[PDB]
Design an enzyme around this catalytic site. Structure first.
Site, PDB file in Angstrom:
ATOM      1  N   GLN A   1       0.661  -1.232   0.343  1.00 36.17           N
ATOM      2  CA  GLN A   1       0.116   0.236   0.299  1.00 36.17           C
ATOM      3  C   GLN A   1       0.854   1.268  -0.595  1.00 36.17           C
ATOM      4  O   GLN A   1       0.310   2.253  -0.388  1.00 36.17           O
ATOM      5  CB  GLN A   1      -1.048  -0.312   0.957  1.00 36.17           C
ATOM      6  CG  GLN A   1      -0.635   0.155   2.640  1.00 36.17           C
ATOM      7  CD  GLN A   1      -1.450   0.332   3.562  1.00 36.17           C
ATOM      8  OE1 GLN A   1      -1.660  -1.179   3.845  1.00 36.17           O
ATOM      9  NE2 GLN A   1      -1.698   0.693   4.798  1.00 36.17           N
TER      10      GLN A   1
ATOM     11  N   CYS B   1      -5.206   0.695   3.529  1.00 33.55           N
ATOM     12  CA  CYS B   1      -5.536  -1.087   3.668  1.00 33.55           C
ATOM     13  C   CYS B   1      -6.756  -1.725   3.860  1.00 33.55           C
ATOM     14  O   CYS B   1      -7.177  -2.782   3.499  1.00 33.55           O
ATOM     15  CB  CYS B   1      -5.456  -1.234   5.382  1.00 33.55           C
ATOM     16  SG  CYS B   1      -6.316  -0.517   6.187  1.00 33.55           S
TER      17      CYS B   1
ATOM     18  N   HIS C   1      -6.640  -1.944  11.915  1.00 37.46           N
ATOM     19  CA  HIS C   1      -6.462  -2.307  11.007  1.00 37.46           C
ATOM     20  C   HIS C   1      -7.003  -3.147  10.215  1.00 37.46           C
ATOM     21  O   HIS C   1      -7.469  -4.284  10.330  1.00 37.46           O
ATOM     22  CB  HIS C   1      -4.665  -2.520  10.637  1.00 37.46           C
ATOM     23  CG  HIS C   1      -3.976  -3.315   9.856  1.00 37.46           C
ATOM     24  ND1 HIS C   1      -4.256  -2.795   8.156  1.00 37.46           N
ATOM     25  CD2 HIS C   1      -2.543  -4.462   9.868  1.00 37.46           C
ATOM     26  CE1 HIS C   1      -3.271  -3.220   7.746  1.00 37.46           C
ATOM     27  NE2 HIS C   1      -2.651  -3.998   8.508  1.00 37.46           N
TER      28      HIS C   1
ATOM     29  N   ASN D   1      -1.729 -10.168   5.174  1.00 37.23           N
ATOM     30  CA  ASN D   1      -1.565  -7.935   4.871  1.00 37.23           C
ATOM     31  C   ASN D   1      -1.025  -7.858   3.613  1.00 37.23           C
ATOM     32  O   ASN D   1      -1.160  -8.154   2.792  1.00 37.23           O
ATOM     33  CB  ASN D   1      -0.438  -8.249   5.760  1.00 37.23           C
ATOM     34  CG  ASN D   1      -0.217  -6.758   6.972  1.00 37.23           C
ATOM     35  OD1 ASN D   1      -1.225  -5.981   6.566  1.00 37.23           O
ATOM     36  ND2 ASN D   1       0.155  -6.506   7.676  1.00 37.23           N
TER      37      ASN D   1
HETATM   38  C1  LIG Z   1      -5.415   0.955   6.993  1.00 38.14           C
HETATM   39  C2  LIG Z   1      -4.107   0.732   8.176  1.00 38.14           C
HETATM   40  S1  LIG Z   1      -2.485   0.977   8.458  1.00 38.14           S
HETATM   41  O1  LIG Z   1      -1.819  -0.363   7.641  1.00 38.14           O
HETATM   42  O2  LIG Z   1      -2.416   0.311   9.978  1.00 38.14           O
HETATM   43  C3  LIG Z   1      -2.167   2.465   8.676  1.00 38.14           C
HETATM   44  C4  LIG Z   1      -1.593   3.155   9.556  1.00 38.14           C
HETATM   45  C5  LIG Z   1      -1.481   4.231   9.387  1.00 38.14           C
HETATM   46  C6  LIG Z   1      -0.982   5.218   8.817  1.00 38.14           C
HETATM   47  C7  LIG Z   1      -1.757   4.566   6.899  1.00 38.14           C
HETATM   48  C8  LIG Z   1      -2.152   3.512   7.423  1.00 38.14           C
HETATM   49  C9  LIG Z   1      -5.988   2.009   7.522  1.00 38.14           C
HETATM   50  C10 LIG Z   1      -5.173   3.725   8.092  1.00 38.14           C
HETATM   51  C11 LIG Z   1      -6.012   4.875   8.269  1.00 38.14           C
HETATM   52  C12 LIG Z   1      -5.621   5.467   8.211  1.00 38.14           C
HETATM   53  C13 LIG Z   1      -4.925   6.179   9.998  1.00 38.14           C
HETATM   54  C14 LIG Z   1      -4.458   7.597  10.449  1.00 38.14           C
HETATM   55  C15 LIG Z   1      -3.059   8.017   9.405  1.00 38.14           C
HETATM   56  C16 LIG Z   1      -3.212   7.707   8.038  1.00 38.14           C
HETATM   57  C17 LIG Z   1      -4.574   6.355   7.941  1.00 38.14           C
HETATM   58  N1  LIG Z   1      -7.080   1.656   8.494  1.00 38.14           N
HETATM   59  C18 LIG Z   1      -8.280   1.935   7.954  1.00 38.14           C
HETATM   60  O3  LIG Z   1      -8.451   2.555   6.870  1.00 38.14           O
HETATM   61  C19 LIG Z   1      -9.681   1.368   8.768  1.00 38.14           C
HETATM   62  C20 LIG Z   1     -10.067  -0.040   8.643  1.00 38.14           C
HETATM   63  C21 LIG Z   1     -11.383   0.116   9.438  1.00 38.14           C
HETATM   64  S2  LIG Z   1     -10.922  -1.841  10.083  1.00 38.14           S
HETATM   65  O4  LIG Z   1     -10.434  -2.544  10.467  1.00 38.14           O
HETATM   66  O5  LIG Z   1     -10.106  -0.309  11.988  1.00 38.14           O
HETATM   67  C22 LIG Z   1     -12.598  -0.876  11.414  1.00 38.14           C
HETATM   68  C23 LIG Z   1     -13.103  -1.010  12.700  1.00 38.14           C
HETATM   69  C24 LIG Z   1     -14.299  -0.879  12.954  1.00 38.14           C
HETATM   70  C25 LIG Z   1     -15.500  -1.450  12.413  1.00 38.14           C
HETATM   71  C26 LIG Z   1     -14.803  -2.763  11.007  1.00 38.14           C
HETATM   72  C27 LIG Z   1     -13.371  -2.456  10.581  1.00 38.14           C
HETATM   73  N2  LIG Z   1     -10.699   2.777   8.945  1.00 38.14           N
HETATM   74  C28 LIG Z   1      -9.940   4.345   9.588  1.00 38.14           C
HETATM   75  O6  LIG Z   1      -9.057   4.114   9.382  1.00 38.14           O
HETATM   76  N3  LIG Z   1     -11.264   5.064   9.113  1.00 38.14           N
HETATM   77  C29 LIG Z   1     -10.694   6.244   9.769  1.00 38.14           C
HETATM   78  C30 LIG Z   1     -11.472   7.339   8.987  1.00 38.14           C
HETATM   79  O7  LIG Z   1     -12.794   6.583   8.404  1.00 38.14           O
HETATM   80  C31 LIG Z   1     -13.067   5.771   8.677  1.00 38.14           C
HETATM   81  C32 LIG Z   1     -12.462   5.247   8.984  1.00 38.14           C
END
Ligand SMILES: *[C@H](CS(=O)(=O)c1ccccc1)[C@H](CCc1ccccc1)NC(=O)[C@H](CCS(=O)(=O)c1ccccc1)NC(=O)N1CCOCC1
Length: 217
Positions: free
Chosen positions: A19, A25, A164, A184
């Site tokens: 990614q 993710c 994540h 992953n």
């Molecule tokens: C992907 C995860 S990662 O690789 O750990 C990551 C860490 C740091 C930076 C980038 C990616 C992604 C990361 C979001 C992010 C956070 C901070 C800065 C930049 C980017 N995570 C998400 O997209 C999660 C996915 C949903 S979940 O699996 O957590 C979940 C939660 C609840 C129910 C079902 C599944 N979602 C989000 O982070 N968000 C935040 C924004 O609004 C939508 C959901």
């Protein structure tokens, strides 16, 4: 239910993706689940466009492109849009762009999706075995997760506070210790060739069974 399952063996899992600087993710977790269903229904395995979800499944779906999203709303978008492109036709550029969906290059469609009960690893197991790869969220905020390389991952300070999105492609046990086989999206340099085996039946360790879901073509 079989003592173990590995959908890679069944030729239902594309190559591990990277990614990069874009935190999509959720996008990768969603396409992974559909890819397995596309294969299971057409004998053809193709990587689906993650970029397609990042640029088109936006605000109306509660997603924020590279800044985070939901696997479930990603599925609803594919249903509403009645299609998603392949990676080849809509490559991953790791950045938010104007939606460029093109039905001319559609690779898959979605009929509906299912959310599994919270915390039920027994139901997740039955789903992974009978339905296919399931999209799940895990708590991957701890360094022990980043430094992973081998064995069944167990982090005492993990919580059900998921953040994540990844993909469960199987389960089994390694030396008595049960695990979930998780794909992953941090490239092949993470854990063991892009995958990680997470503790199974340890009270929803790292919240792996908190919000499971999978699509159905
Ligand atoms: C992907 C995860 S990662 O690789 O750990 C990551 C860490 C740091 C930076 C980038 C990616 C992604 C990361 C979001 C992010 C956070 C901070 C800065 C930049 C980017 N995570 C998400 O997209 C999660 C996915 C949903 S979940 O699996 O957590 C979940 C939660 C609840 C129910 C079902 C599944 N979602 C989000 O982070 N968000 C935040 C924004 O609004 C939508 C959901």
């Amino acid at each position: 239910l079989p003592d173990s399952v590995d959908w890679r063996e069944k030729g239902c899992v594309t190559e591990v993706k990277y990614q990069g600087s874009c935190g999509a993710c959720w996008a990768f977790s969603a396409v992974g689940a559909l890819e397995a269903q596309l294969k299971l229904k057409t004998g053809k395995l193709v990587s689906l466009s993650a970029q397609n979800l990042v640029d088109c499944s936006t605000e109306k779906y509660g997603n924020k492109g590279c800044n985070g999203g939901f696997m479930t709303t990603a599925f609803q978008y594919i249903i509403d849009n009645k299609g998603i492109d392949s990676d080849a036709s809509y490559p991953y550029k790791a950045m938010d762009q104007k939606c460029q969906y093109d039905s001319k290059y559609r690779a898959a469609t979605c009929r509906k999706y299912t959310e599994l009960p919270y915390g039920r690893e027994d139901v997740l197991k039955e789903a992974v075995a009978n339905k296919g790869p399931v999209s799940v969220g895990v708590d991957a905020r701890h360094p022990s997760f980043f430094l992973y390389r081998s064995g069944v991952y167990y982090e005492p300070s993990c919580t059900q506070n998921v953040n994540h999105g990844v993909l469960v492609v199987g389960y089994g046990d390694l030396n008595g210790k049960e695990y979930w086989l998780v794909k992953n999206s941090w490239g092949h340099n993470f854990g063991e060739k892009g995958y990680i085996r997470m503790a199974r039946n340890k009270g929803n360790h790292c919240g792996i069974a908190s919000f499971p879901s999978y699509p159905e073509i």
